[PDB]
Design an enzyme around this catalytic site. Sequence first.
Site, PDB file in Angstrom:
ATOM      1  N   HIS A 113       0.771  -1.254   0.000  1.00  0.00           N
ATOM      2  CA  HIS A 113       0.000   0.000   0.000  1.00  0.00           C
ATOM      3  C   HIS A 113       0.796   1.295   0.000  1.00  0.00           C
ATOM      4  CE1 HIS A 113       0.185  -0.050   4.565  1.00  0.00           C
ATOM      5  NE2 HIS A 113       0.040  -1.346   4.356  1.00  0.00           N
ATOM      6  N   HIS A 134       6.050   7.004   5.672  1.00  0.00           N
ATOM      7  CA  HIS A 134       5.615   6.511   4.375  1.00  0.00           C
ATOM      8  C   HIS A 134       4.964   7.666   3.629  1.00  0.00           C
ATOM      9  CE1 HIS A 134       2.079   6.238   6.954  1.00  0.00           C
ATOM     10  NE2 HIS A 134       1.457   6.595   5.844  1.00  0.00           N
ATOM     11  N   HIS A 147       1.833   8.929   0.464  1.00  0.00           N
ATOM     12  CA  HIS A 147       0.674   8.733  -0.370  1.00  0.00           C
ATOM     13  C   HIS A 147       0.897   9.627  -1.576  1.00  0.00           C
ATOM     14  CE1 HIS A 147      -1.384   6.810   3.048  1.00  0.00           C
ATOM     15  NE2 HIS A 147      -0.717   7.691   3.762  1.00  0.00           N
ATOM     16  N   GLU A 188      -3.662  13.270   1.036  1.00  0.00           N
ATOM     17  CA  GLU A 188      -4.834  12.819   1.765  1.00  0.00           C
ATOM     18  C   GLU A 188      -5.562  14.014   2.377  1.00  0.00           C
ATOM     19  OE1 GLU A 188      -3.569   9.426   4.153  1.00  0.00           O
ATOM     20  OE2 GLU A 188      -4.332   8.269   2.496  1.00  0.00           O
ATOM     21  N   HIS A 208       3.802  11.040   5.773  1.00  0.00           N
ATOM     22  CA  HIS A 208       3.360  10.777   7.133  1.00  0.00           C
ATOM     23  C   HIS A 208       4.493  10.215   7.930  1.00  0.00           C
ATOM     24  CE1 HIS A 208      -1.032  10.451   5.649  1.00  0.00           C
ATOM     25  NE2 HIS A 208      -0.607  11.692   5.761  1.00  0.00           N
ATOM     26  N   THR A 221      -5.087   6.627   8.488  1.00  0.00           N
ATOM     27  CA  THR A 221      -5.785   6.710   7.196  1.00  0.00           C
ATOM     28  C   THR A 221      -5.772   5.425   6.392  1.00  0.00           C
ATOM     29  OG1 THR A 221      -3.937   7.520   5.860  1.00  0.00           O
ATOM     30  CG2 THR A 221      -5.276   9.135   7.060  1.00  0.00           C
ATOM     31  N   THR A 222      -5.205   4.364   6.957  1.00  0.00           N
ATOM     32  CA  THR A 222      -5.297   3.004   6.416  1.00  0.00           C
ATOM     33  C   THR A 222      -5.888   2.122   7.501  1.00  0.00           C
ATOM     34  OG1 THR A 222      -2.999   2.542   7.147  1.00  0.00           O
ATOM     35  CG2 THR A 222      -3.346   3.177   4.837  1.00  0.00           C
TER      36      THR A 222
END
Length: 257
Positions: free
Chosen positions: A61, A91, A93, A103, A116, A195-196
């Site tokens: 992801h 990590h 996004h 996000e 993040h 958020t995951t």
Amino acid sequence: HWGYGKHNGPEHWHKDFPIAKGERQSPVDIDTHTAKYDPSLKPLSVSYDQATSLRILNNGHSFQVTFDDSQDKAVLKGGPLDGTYRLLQFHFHWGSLDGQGSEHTVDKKKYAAELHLVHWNTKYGDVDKALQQPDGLAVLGIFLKVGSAKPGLQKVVDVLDSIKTEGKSADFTNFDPRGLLPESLDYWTYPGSLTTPPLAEGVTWIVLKEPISVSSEQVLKFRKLNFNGEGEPEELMVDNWRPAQPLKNRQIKASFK
Ligand SMILES: [Cl-]
Ligand SMILES: [Zn+2]
């Protein structure tokens, strides 16, 4: 498995993780004219000088860099936080195009990507216990826009070839996360969630106002990663972002006027 596609993406997550429709989900749109300047917030203290990075991993992801969190080596304190929060991992996004990928949004503006840095509250002793607390985690969120290269990101970009597919990892020691930060520590803060999945409602969000610029070549390299495992049909790791969730009965505070 959960993911970001039509059949397993964010609109599906609530079936396995009902907290997806909860009262303090992230990310959110930051309406800059509704956020309240809070003169009582402290400055945020980011103490990353002794950080000890360990590994870089494609988890299917995102890609993540993991740190040794057994001592107070790389910590976040102050700002809205009570006590000391240890850096566990960072990590990203990102998008398929430069106009999406973040996000959080700022007055509905999407950035190309979002970093993040995930920390946990040392009063709970480990991250798995912290995950179960309403003040267990703090995530420092930093927007990326495309412009000039970010030199401190380049060592990350150069190892991505070695973790193309899900489950691949590599040594990633002596990485300095200070090279990922913008000049200003001005921030917005609100109570939210991971958020995951598992979408745990235990995060104090600290979102920096100033984005970092990264080059087009840097973000192109993000987009070469794969969601899939080795040997499976190639599905580029792009648009691995959850969209904005309902603010509900939350207030976003600003550290700056
Ligand atoms: Cl699937
Ligand atoms: Zn994230």
